[PDB]
């Protein structure tokens, strides 16, 4: 008669998680590689999906920590001594205007808030609230996104949450200043329904709940072979 | 003047009216539903365990140095205890342990006896380790040394140092009695169940030692008994194991 | 029941050369607790009482020349032997120790070949 | 005024954070039937126990179905088992052992379940036999009786329970612990025959459920070992 | 009748130490060069091994300061201007995952506190709790691993602290700037249990009690030899 | 607003600091027998005495052992020793001195218990004799008897006890102190010889404890002298 407080729900899907992980410079280049993007979701990491697939429907606030670490670029004009880099985080609601490019419009909306980090400070975090038009995030949907039985099979428009993105403030005149994004992600005030089986086959796509077939178990030598055996001893005479 | 002890209904003793130290101050008991990180309820065997058990006798003599056992290894052999210890999985009891001298008034000596708890015990090679059979054997005494042991897997055993590593004066920080042939003939120790876990297994866990060690010589004279017997006794109290059925 | 094959005939090779024969057993043969291997190799003179080279598969008998040398882990087990002898005549066992019951070998015996 | 844990980034720290979003308003929510409180209440639901897989079954069907032969079985075993679950490879794929496998420690009873699907016609009986963790598995009837059995008969009743107890040393069982010999063991028997009048089939089968008792403890949240790939999808 | 306030076991036992001093590079090298390690014990200082020994149980809260300076470091390609050096450190409980190098993804676990500090700031510090699976530490224990009495002998698994590892987050191209960590232990509200005799011969192993035969004491000339002695004088005459 | 002492680390502060490990819950604790609430307790402890540490003895049982031997000795010293714990020889390695060898300053009074390990038919005197600090040790047993002394008879009692008492200029003594000669000394003399029957022993021991009164003081904690290696251990 010991204790359940850590099967909870709240104990058991509010552990940080790291997400994302990725890379962005800050000088000339290809401009897709001046800025980072990601579109939130919990269905590319495989460990945190196998979690949340336990239930039909979630209901959650999310909290993210972005972790940022930037080092110079080997080449040559190398900087001799640079102030300080400021970087610009913006998190953009479903249907508000995304960058194409960096130095566009979009990063100055009203409508999108936005941090400014300064190296050498605490991590940057924020938290969003539960922003849907439903009253629930669901992780299985069987159906289709029209009523003409056709379209995206699978496919909700009820669950999105918008976008990230990272960039550079300063304008870099001598050498390149390479920078690494972290995000850290965990649920708050997590409520959820309808317990299901979890899964046995392994993903294959993040979309998808498409699998390959696979053996319910692990094999055995008999059905009355009990667990390997011992040899004779002291005990056993 | 005498009193008899009736333990188990199978065993008598005889005991004068001698002082007794109860261990560091408590007295064994059974476990309360306070203190507890398991589910099943223990079994509390009581009817054979609490008896007395008497140990082989040893020889005291003028040029012996001193004896420890380890407990509870010491009674593997003994009876229902064994049984016990061999069935079950984890265990816990307090002992009483009653040791004896016969020496007439024309003999003289001084023994102290301590109950070390956790009392982990040094190699004669500090770079190798013991092995379990140097430790201690099951129910024989193990003895000291008058000088430095150079074996490998075989724990130190210069006197003044315990094998311990610590100075053997300073022993009577433990539980413990003097034993004057003088003045005194026996003593009495009851120490409870010490440990930083309520159940432990039984050969796995070393409880404590008991140590007999002289500081004054024996001496006599021709015609006399060459020795002096040494008698321990061991009676368990308050003895639990764990339970084998379902809930 | 628990039991081990031997080679599939006997030697039957030339005096003086190394020899090498395994033991299949019939299940596992070792103890993960311990990491011990409950088998020997025996050794019968015709007429007199049998004797084994090495136990344990690591661990010569106190005694043996050091021609037999005893390996194998787990299921399997073999025996080496650098120089064999004309009057090393015996039926050579694999037998095991493990648990009930304490079965034998399958026989081999060193024929002539000169 | 500033102690040496005052400027870091802790990722298992509860602190309130700035909204991202104040002035927005979110949706209330409504009555869903079916609301989650605990994980333990996804482990106390029976689930069908793949007993029989034999290398031949682990890709069919056949896994679930124990098989019980009629003709004339003098004294032969059924089936037997080793009761660790979330370790052992009977129990590991269950809802109860898939939830276990998350908990670095654990503890607790374990309900077994016996349903024998068979003609309405069929009689005979089987002895269920349980050793304790320290034993030894009964090797012939008698030694199985000699111990903890019950004799089940599929005549007057069709659904067998057994609680299989919790007694250990510690009070916290492992899900990486190598304590093979040391979990108990549950095993059946054939006291009698299965017999039939003229016109039923004589052969029929046992299914076998398993689930957790009123009482159970976890401790030491942790990965899961069943998913492999750490590579992000696409 | 003078007060004896000090030599309680709280005012006895709650001195900072330094337990650990370490050197790690911030550039190219040998990995295990850049970053620093230690798992958490008493048992390798012996001035702090003599006063935790006068007990045999006991039980306490760690605090843990460290102390980190940074300098440049000799050869071509110095760098003229650096704008800040930020170091990770990160405490791994009993069973986490440990690195076995640097830029590893042991580094972004959720499950590992983690603290990154700027330099100029004050030193930083965390407190873990008692921390164990049992009811107290012990720092002698008779006995074996396993129950075969064989294996490691006077070796308990209920006294584990963890690990802490100490990197560098910035990523260098321009030179080498090594980095030195000076770890200071204390621990809190300490209760200890069923003291013992202090100890006699000096110390060998770590890991074991072993140790050589010493004297019980310093020699002197004489059963009866006071100590010196005072020549004639006025007070003599 | 931001004073000079505002951003420092004083390795002696007591601060509170952030958890690395909060949303844990530790394990309750038990009652262990044999707390420990003062270092006092550890001093208050007879421990014997290794009086006879004469170069031969170091390394023996002997140390322990005071030798009291029989024939005729007229008027010789038994022993003799100077009071003096944590810094004389004798002292520095018992329980007491090794306690008061952690604080640079101490004081109180020592209690010191002979007993006499001899045959039970052997009988005698012994006279204890005790010099203030600035006084000289007794050279014959005339001079002891006239200063303060008392006559321990060994057929009477067999254990004799005494209370070595605390007069200073100042309130605290120093383990590092230079101030021999002005500590106080202890003498043992043959009062009479010891008588024993035909058949007893004729000679014996005696056994030294030495341990802590009830008032004792100890300020300003310092490392020990007894250990010496500042190395790290592998």
């Given at each position: 008669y010991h204790s359940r407080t850590e099967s909870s729900i709240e104990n058991f899907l509010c552990r940080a998680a790291c997400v994302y992980i990725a890379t962005y410079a800050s000088a000339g280049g290809t401009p897709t590689e001046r800025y980072a993007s990601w579109r939130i979701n919990t269905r590319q990491m495989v460990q945190l999906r196998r979690k949340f697939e336990l239930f039909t429907y979630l209901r959650f606030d999310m909290e993210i920590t972005f972790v940022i670490t930037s080092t110079q670029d080997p080449g040559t004009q190398l900087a001799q001594d640079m102030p300080v880099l400021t970087h610009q985080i913006m998190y953009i609601p479903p249907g508000g205007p995304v960058p194409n490019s960096a130095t566009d419009f979009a990063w100055q909306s009203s409508t999108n808030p936005s941090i400014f980090w300064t190296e050498g400070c605490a991590p940057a975090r924020m938290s969003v609230p539960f922003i849907s038009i439903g009253n629930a995030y669901s992780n299985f949907y069987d159906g289709w996104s029209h009523f003409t039985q056709e379209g995206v099979y699978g496919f909700n428009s009820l669950n999105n949450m918008g976008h990230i993105y990272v960039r550079h403030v300063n304008e870099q005149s001598l050498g390149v200043s390479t920078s690494t994004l972290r995000v850290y992600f965990k649920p708050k005030h997590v409520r959820a329904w309808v317990p299901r089986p979890p899964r046995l086959s392994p993903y294959v796509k993040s979309s998808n709940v498409n699998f390959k077939p696979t053996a319910v178990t692990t094999e055995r030598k008999d059905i009355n072979d009990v667990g390997t055996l011992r040899p004779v001893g002291y005990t056993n005479h | 003047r005498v009193r008899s002890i009736t333990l188990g209904n199978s065993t008598i003793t005889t005991q004068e009216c001698a002082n007794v130290v109860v261990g560091y101050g408590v007295w064994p008991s059974y476990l309360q539903d306070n203190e507890a990180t398991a589910e099943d309820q223990p079994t509390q065997p009581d009817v054979a365990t609490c008896r007395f058990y008497t140990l082989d006798s040893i020889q005291w003599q003028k040029e012996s140095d001193g004896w420890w056992w380890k407990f509870p290894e010491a009674l593997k052999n003994m009876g229902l205890f064994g049984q016990n210890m061999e069935y079950?999985?984890?265990?816990?009891?307090?002992?009483?342990?009653?040791?004896?001298?016969?020496?007439?008034?024309?003999?003289?000596?001084?023994?102290?006896?301590?109950?070390?708890?956790?009392?982990?015990?040094?190699?004669?090679?500090?770079?190798?380790?013991?092995?379990?059979?140097?430790?201690?054997?099951?129910?024989?005494?193990?003895?000291?040394?008058?000088?430095?042991?150079?074996?490998?897997?075989?724990?130190?055993?210069?006197?003044?140092?315990?094998?311990?590593?610590?100075?053997?004066?300073?022993?009577?920080?433990?539980?413990?009695?003097?034993?004057?042939?003088?003045?005194?003939?026996s003593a009495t120790i009851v120490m409870p169940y010490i440990n930083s876990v309520p159940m432990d297994n039984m050969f796995r866990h070393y409880n404590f030692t008991l140590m007999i060690i002289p500081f004054a010589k024996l001496e006599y004279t021709e015609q006399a008994s060459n020795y002096v017997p040494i008698t321990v006794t061991v009676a368990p109290m308050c003895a639990e194991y764990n339970g084998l059925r379902l809930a | 029941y628990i039991e081990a094959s031997q080679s599939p005939s006997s030697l039957a090779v030339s005096v003086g050369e190394k020899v090498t024969m395994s033991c299949k057993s019939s299940q596992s043969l070792l103890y993960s607790s311990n990491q011990k291997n409950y088998l020997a190799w025996f050794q019968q003179k015709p007429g007199q009482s049998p004797k084994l080279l090495i136990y344990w598969a690591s661990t010569r008998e106190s005694g043996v020349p050091d021609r037999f040398t005893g390996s194998g882990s787990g299921t399997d087990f073999t025996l080496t032997i650098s120089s064999v002898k004309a009057e090393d005549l015996a039926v050579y066992y694999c037998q095991q120790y493990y648990s009930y019951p304490y079965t034998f070998g399958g026989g081999t015996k060193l024929k002539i070949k000169r | 005024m500033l102690t040496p844990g005052s400027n870091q980034f802790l990722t298992s720290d509860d602190f309130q954070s700035p909204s991202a979003m104040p002035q927005f308003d979110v949706t209330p929510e409504m009555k869903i039937p079916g609301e989650v409180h605990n994980l333990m209440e996804i482990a106390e639901v029976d689930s069908v126990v793949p007993v029989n897989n034999t290398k031949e079954n682990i890709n069919s069907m056949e896994a679930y179905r124990i098989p019980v032969t009629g003709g004339d079985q003098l004294h032969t075993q059924v089936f037997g088992f080793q009761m660790q679950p979330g370790l052992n490879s009977v129990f590991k794929r269950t809802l109860l052992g898939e939830i276990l496998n998350y908990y670095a420690h654990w503890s607790g009873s374990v309900k077994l379940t016996f349903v024998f699907c068979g003609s309405a016609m069929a009689t005979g009986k089987f002895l269920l036999a349980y050793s304790p963790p320290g034993a030894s598995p009964p090797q012939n009837r008698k030694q199985a009786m000699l111990g903890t059995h019950v004799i089940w008969d599929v005549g007057l009743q069709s659904s067998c329970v057994l609680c299989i107890p919790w007694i250990s040393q510690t009070h916290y069982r492992l899900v990486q612990q190598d304590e093979y010999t040391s979990a108990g063991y549950v095993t059946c028997w054939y006291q009698t025959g299965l017999i039939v009048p003229p016109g039923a089939p004589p052969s029929c089968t046992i299914l076998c459920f398993a689930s957790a008792c009123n009482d159970f403890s976890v401790r030491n949240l942790r990965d899961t070992p069943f998913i492999e790939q750490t590579q992000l999808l696409q």
């Open positions: - | 079950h999985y984890l265990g816990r009891s307090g002992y009483t342990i009653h040791v004896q001298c016969n020496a007439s008034k024309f003999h003289q000596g001084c023994l102290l006896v301590v109950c070390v708890p956790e009392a982990e015990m040094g190699c004669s090679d500090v770079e190798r380790e013991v092995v379990a059979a140097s430790l201690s054997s099951e129910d024989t005494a193990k003895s000291f040394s008058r000088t430095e042991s150079n074996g490998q897997h075989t724990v130190q055993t210069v006197v003044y140092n315990a094998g311990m590593g610590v100075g053997v004066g300073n022993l009577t920080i433990f539980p413990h009695q003097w034993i004057n042939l003088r003045t005194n003939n | - | -």
